[PDB]
């Protein structure tokens, strides 16, 4: 019936002054735009249909054409920035915000989705969606005693759109918008649907990806224990944003870092640092590196939780970008650690896999590693035990490596090698 129309036929019907012909043509547009293989978005745009669709959003008298045009506009807005811009340029934002109040769930849901696509384009349209007042009617859709009474697909769309209002970083979303959204995000973080949980975690990971004051607004909401719990989820789509969020939080202050430690996060890192998903291992190890950049009592928690052997393991075998985060984790550890903490690191076997990574081509990890060795020697000096570390480093081929880097394109590698050699190998 409305399957496989031409754009010309769609235009013919939409330009009729027959609401029912317009409705059928709009549905035909929507089915065209709904196909997975090359939906003719630009042809639809070029035909001048967006303003018509937008005006159909206002036809309260004809809810099906509201839905069809909402769906059509959603899929145009799902495209490139220029395609999303065409939807915004047609005045769709306030019209979609008005549809949030529709008594038809499938129509307000489509409007939720469309606003999510628009906000998802970037911070400019995100903030424009906010300026048009989308947040209050979005949150009002979630103002029910129990989220479980809402349709699951409906709740997932709302969560996803809310997460796009939290997304993107220059600028980050307006502070008052974040504060307005955060109590609903906290609630969604306790809902029992894995996709709502994943998208709530994504939203929190965006909100915590910024300066310490952004992290603080989230941490002050009390969500870190829940994040840590989600960190133990079996669903990778939940663990990944939950870990990004936890990792972001530990980029903040020592006090914000302490709250993820207090919440039990370190007990999950044996799994995370051996996780089969390399991106999880990289994130977990990056997170570990920022925890070992903390206080000695925080380094001590890493020790107590048995995590140094896991860092030795990741240094020993992991994809290179994880090994580099492990190298950073070690250098941070050796920079802030006590002497006995640094000794324990050597006792756990850090030296050999550290030396093996001096053969890496990446010259930054070499600086990281030589800095760590320097700090370990500095602790060995405080114990009179510089020689047996020199032997240890020599016995595994590390002296060969420090001698190699003696000649190296980079001046900072260059210098740290010979200084280590002249001071500890003579």
């Amino acid at each position: 019936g409305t399957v496989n129309w031409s754009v010309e036929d769609i235009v013919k019907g939409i330009n009729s002054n027959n609401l029912e012909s317009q409705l059928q043509a709009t549905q035909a547009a929507r089915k065209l735009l709904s196909r997975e293989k090359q939906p003719p978005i630009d042809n639809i745009i070029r035909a001048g249909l967006i303003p018509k669709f937008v005006s159909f959003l206002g036809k309260t008298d004809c809810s099906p054409i509201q839905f069809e045009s909402a769906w059509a506009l959603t899929n145009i807005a799902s495209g490139t920035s220029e395609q999303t811009k065409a939807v915004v340029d047609g005045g769709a934002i306030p019209a979609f915000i008005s549809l949030l109040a529709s008594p038809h769930a499938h129509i307000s849901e489509q409007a939720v989705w469309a606003l999510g696509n628009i906000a998802g384009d970037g911070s400019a349209f995100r903030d424009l969606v906010i300026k048009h007042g989308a947040i209050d009617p979005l949150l009002a859709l979630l103002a029910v005693p129990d989220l479980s009474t809402l349709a699951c697909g409906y709740l997932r769309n709302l969560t996803w759109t809310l997460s796009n209002l939290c997304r993107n970083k220059n600028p980050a979303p307006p502070l008052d918008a974040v504060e307005q959204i955060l109590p609903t995000l906290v609630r969604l973080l306790h809902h029992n649907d894995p996709e709502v949980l994943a998208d709530s975690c994504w939203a929190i990971s965006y909100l915590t990806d910024g300066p310490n004051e952004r992290i603080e607004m989230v941490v002050k909401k009390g969500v870190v224990p829940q994040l840590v719990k989600l960190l133990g989820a079996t669903e990778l789509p939940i663990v990944t944003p939950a870990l990004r969020a936890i990792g972001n939080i530990v980029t903040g202050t020592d006090e914000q870092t302490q709250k993820v430690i207090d919440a039990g996060a370190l007990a999950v890192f044996p799994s995370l640092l051996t996780n089969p998903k390399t991106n999880i291992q990289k994130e977990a190890t990056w997170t570990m590196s920022n925890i070992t950049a903390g206080r000695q009592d925080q380094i001590q928690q890493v020790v107590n939780h048995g995590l140094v052997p896991f860092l030795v393991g990741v240094l020993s075998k992991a994809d290179f970008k994880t090994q580099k985060e492990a190298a950073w984790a070690i250098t941070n550890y050796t920079s802030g650690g006590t002497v006995e903490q640094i000794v324990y690191l050597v006792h756990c076997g850090i030296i050999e896999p550290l030396m093996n990574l001096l053969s890496a081509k990446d010259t930054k990890i070499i600086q990281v590693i030589l800095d760590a060795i320097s700090n370990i020697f500095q602790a060995a000096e405080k114990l009179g035990e510089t020689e047996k570390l020199s032997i240890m480093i020599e016995e595994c081929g590390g002296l060969d490596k420090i001698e190699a880097l003696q000649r190296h394109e980079n001046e900072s590698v260059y210098k740290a090698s010979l200084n280590l050699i002249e001071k500890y190998f003579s």
Binding site: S34, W71, N75, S78, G79, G116, G120, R167, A198, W202
Partner: peptide, 10 residues
């Protein structure tokens, strides 16, 4: 992140 934008095939 997961996707910035979502297309509805339904």
């Amino acid at each position: 992140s997961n996707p910035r934008k979502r297309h509805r095939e339904d």
